[PDB]
Amino acid sequence: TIKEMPQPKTFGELKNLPLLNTDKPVQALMKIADELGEIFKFEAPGRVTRYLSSQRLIKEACDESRFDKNLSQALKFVRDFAGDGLATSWTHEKNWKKAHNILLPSFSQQAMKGYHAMMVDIAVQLVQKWERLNADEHIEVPEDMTRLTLDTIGLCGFNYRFNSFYRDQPHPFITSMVRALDEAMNKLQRANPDDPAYDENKRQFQEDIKVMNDLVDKIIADRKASGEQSDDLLTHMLNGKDPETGEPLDDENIRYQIITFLIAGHETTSGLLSFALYFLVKNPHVLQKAAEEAARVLVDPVPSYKQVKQLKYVGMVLNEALRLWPTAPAFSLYAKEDTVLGGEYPLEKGDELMVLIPQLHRDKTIWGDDVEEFRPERFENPSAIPQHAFKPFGNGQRACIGQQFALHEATLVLGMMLKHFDFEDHTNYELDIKETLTLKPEGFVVKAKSKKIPL
Ligand code: HEM
Ligand SMILES: [Zn+2]
């Protein structure tokens, strides 16, 4: 049988588009899903997408023999600076498979051991900065976490120090990257792309891409010319070879991968830490229990790799923050062939499906009826979690390569925060979620009272 798919309010020949005019599209899409259910059609001038919200359908959509990763309009605009990096490539570009296999060993749990000390390095700068604030002052949470994640990726990725914690105005590369990312997002909602009013926007965009390219190209060229072997991803990318060509990644592609790591990882990870902390201060019983685990486990001046792994509850809190607000909230797929989804919905080859992760994570048939509650205990038994139920890192071979990295980073950082300070929600902050490529709690601020424990 064939079921007719719901469709939200239409606005004539504008179709459903005026519904995504808002500055919070994902949140708008979730409300429609709350009204229309597990699947709905979204129609735009020339374009048709289907939105998936239930585990039942998403499960099926994640069958990689039938569906593959699609480059959404957002990723196509990002590709202007991330090029054929991992996140902005079609699965069937040869550079996708080649980079994937070369870089995979660099991102395993095991590799995390090598990154550990560099992660602690930026974490201590975080801790020492908070220790030096006057009682007077407060913390801009997502701003400080972004400072930390950029610098950790900068250092772990290509042994470069942006020194974000020691400067008012950000390092030129970061200003350009931030600006170049924002323009690429602003272009999604842009009315007349060729209008002369955007001539300066267009000009700034190319300047910022050049700033980014100059630095990363210079960094690679200098490492190559110096002829010195090192820890990081750069060395691994310069020496690592494709089994069937015998060739490593070219210098342009390596630049792409490094830009990619910065863009992909910086605000997803800091959003996670900002939402973890948001939930902790709103949920004092959970804070208490996680703070108790930090004091119990983190018995050394500075945490060890092994100690971060024993922070189970902090790991559970991060997963529950990722259930409620996955920081990269959506991912896009296409039908490889003509097919039928859920036995009711026929699909044409090439049809787009968009997985809506924050609705997937609210599937009551999976999680029960307390889906809006912050309850890390949901994750005590990982085997209790059904396949394709929890997907904040994407799917299959196109899943997040930096999942181990992001989670080690966040577990370590959050542990250290909970060990060293007590936190006050001094403004009684109302959750306001800003949407760009990622999600964050905009305007989230706290005060941290030090526990006077030395590092
Ligand atoms: C908690 C933090 C993170 C979240 C929630 C997250 C989420 C995701 C998601 C949902 C995808 C798939 C997107 C799609 O299908 O279009 C993805 C892909 C990717 N992410 Fe992450 N990510 C995080 C951290 C990081 C970090 C730290 C890095 C730095 C290495 C990174 C690098 C990448 C890359 C390279 C891809 C493309 C993988 C491929 O297609 O081969 N991510 N991520
Ligand atoms: Zn057809």
Side-chain angles (χ1 to χ4, degrees):
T1 187
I2 295 172
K3 210 179 206 165
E4 189 76 19
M5 196 174 290
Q7 182 173 26
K9 185 148 278 165
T10 328
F11 292 89
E13 185 255 323
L14 281 166
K15 311 277 163 53
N16 303 116
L17 207 78
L19 302 165
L20 289 194
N21 274 28
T22 182
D23 56 21
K24 303 173 181 198
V26 173
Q27 281 158 280
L29 286 159
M30 294 169 61
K31 185 172 181 281
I32 298 167
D34 287 326
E35 294 160 329
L36 302 192
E38 75 179 341
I39 185 161
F40 64 87
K41 183 161 71 270
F42 199 92
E43 221 169 38
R47 212 186 285 176
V48 193
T49 317
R50 292 158 167 84
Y51 284 94
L52 270 39
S53 276
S54 69
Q55 190 267 347
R56 177 179 100 77
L57 292 177
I58 286 156
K59 165 174 76 181
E60 179 165 350
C62 290
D63 178 347
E64 292 168 279
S65 65
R66 295 172 65 205
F67 311 90
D68 183 31
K69 151 151 176 165
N70 175 62
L71 299 188
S72 66
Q73 195 51 62
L75 299 186
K76 282 170 185 183
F77 287 143
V78 167
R79 178 143 178 158
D80 289 348
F81 47 93
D84 61 5
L86 281 170
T88 53
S89 295
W90 296 100
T91 306
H92 301 286
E93 287 183 61
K94 68 191 161 37
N95 276 163
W96 182 80
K97 195 49 162 157
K98 179 179 172 177
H100 174 254
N101 293 319
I102 284 170
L103 285 169
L104 202 48
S106 282
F107 280 103
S108 44
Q109 188 44 57
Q110 195 67 6
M112 293 310 108
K113 292 167 178 182
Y115 302 124
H116 183 85
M118 292 175 290
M119 293 189 185
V120 174
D121 182 310
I122 309 303
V124 169
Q125 309 184 8
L126 187 267
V127 172
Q128 309 211 290
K129 183 173 96 65
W130 285 7
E131 304 270 43
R132 289 166 177 149
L133 295 174
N134 304 298
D136 199 25
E137 282 136 37
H138 64 270
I139 290 162
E140 305 182 296
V141 171
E143 285 77 3
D144 266 353
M145 308 289 106
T146 307
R147 287 182 188 107
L148 174 296
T149 56
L150 283 164
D151 290 29
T152 303
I153 297 164
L155 180 54
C156 287
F158 47 117
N159 186 58
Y160 193 85
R161 287 172 184 275
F162 302 111
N163 293 320
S164 295
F165 287 123
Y166 305 104
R167 56 197 315 158
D168 288 322
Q169 305 99 52
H171 182 119
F173 174 97
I174 290 171
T175 285
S176 276
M177 195 198 70
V178 160
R179 204 159 48 206
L181 222 189
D182 221 46
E183 164 73 3
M185 293 300 98
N186 276 338
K187 290 208 269 200
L188 291 155
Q189 283 167 320
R190 195 150 289 168
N192 325 110
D194 281 44
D195 199 87
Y198 301 121
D199 278 15
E200 172 59 16
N201 288 229
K202 280 201 186 170
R203 191 215 59 84
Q204 180 68 87
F205 196 52
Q206 299 295 324
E207 180 179 281
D208 287 336
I209 296 171
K210 183 184 170 297
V211 161
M212 285 190 288
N213 290 342
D214 286 352
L215 180 67
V216 182
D217 289 334
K218 179 190 156 171
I219 284 159
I220 302 163
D222 294 339
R223 180 78 60 85
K224 292 187 84 176
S226 83
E228 69 153 76
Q229 313 288 244
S230 174
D231 287 34
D232 62 347
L233 279 154
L234 189 45
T235 294
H236 283 99
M237 269 182 291
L238 296 165
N239 305 336
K241 289 174 210 78
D242 180 6
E244 73 167 292
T245 62
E247 275 153 3
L249 300 161
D250 75 285
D251 291 346
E252 196 201 45
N253 186 253
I254 295 158
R255 170 233 280 176
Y256 287 136
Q257 303 298 359
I258 290 175
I259 295 173
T260 296
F261 302 146
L262 293 159
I263 57 100
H266 84 295
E267 262 180 342
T268 46
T269 314
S270 59
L272 167 51
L273 279 162
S274 310
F275 283 118
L277 185 57
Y278 168 85
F279 285 122
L280 287 185
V281 297
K282 296 308 198 189
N283 290 274
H285 297 164
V286 172
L287 204 186
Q288 189 161 33
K289 188 174 171 197
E292 277 156 28
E293 190 192 57
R296 151 167 22 95
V297 172
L298 300 175
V299 294
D300 304 351
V302 113
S304 67
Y305 172 85
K306 266 170 55 175
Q307 281 166 351
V308 163
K309 282 195 77 216
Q310 286 309 114
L311 287 176
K312 272 82 182 302
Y313 196 69
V314 171
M316 285 169 46
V317 170
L318 289 161
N319 279 147
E320 179 73 345
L322 282 175
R323 184 185 64 79
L324 289 161
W325 295 109
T327 50
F331 68 92
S332 170
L333 317 153
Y334 72 88
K336 282 157 71 55
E337 292 301 332
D338 290 351
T339 196
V340 173
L341 184 77
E344 310 144 288
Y345 304 107
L347 297 172
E348 277 271 10
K349 173 177 176 181
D351 283 337
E352 185 187 17
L353 308 170
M354 189 80 70
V355 182
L356 220 27
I357 310 161
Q359 285 305 106
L360 168 67
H361 294 346
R362 285 155 172 86
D363 187 335
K364 287 178 188 179
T365 77
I366 294 299
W367 302 91
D369 298 87
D370 58 341
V371 290
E372 294 300 321
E373 269 192 47
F374 189 78
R375 185 161 67 76
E377 295 83 6
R378 288 187 209 273
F379 293 90
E380 250 297 310
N381 189 14
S383 90
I385 312 304
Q387 215 204 10
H388 299 134
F390 178 65
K391 301 206 75 65
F393 296 103
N395 186 247
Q397 78 195 321
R398 301 304 302 264
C400 180
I401 205 171
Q403 177 183 342
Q404 275 65 52
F405 195 98
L407 285 179
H408 196 83
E409 163 80 292
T411 300
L412 162 73
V413 168
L414 185 48
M416 288 181 71
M417 283 165 63
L418 299 170
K419 164 167 171 188
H420 288 281
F421 310 88
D422 294 292
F423 300 95
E424 198 203 2
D425 184 8
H426 63 119
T427 50
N428 192 31
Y429 162 87
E430 178 176 7
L431 187 59
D432 180 9
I433 309 188
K434 186 168 174 272
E435 302 195 16
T436 55
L437 190 58
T438 57
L439 305 173
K440 66 170 96 78
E442 193 185 5
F444 181 39
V445 295
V446 301
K447 298 204 200 202
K449 242 173 279 177
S450 182
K451 294 175 178 292
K452 301 310 186 188
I453 306 170
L455 291 147

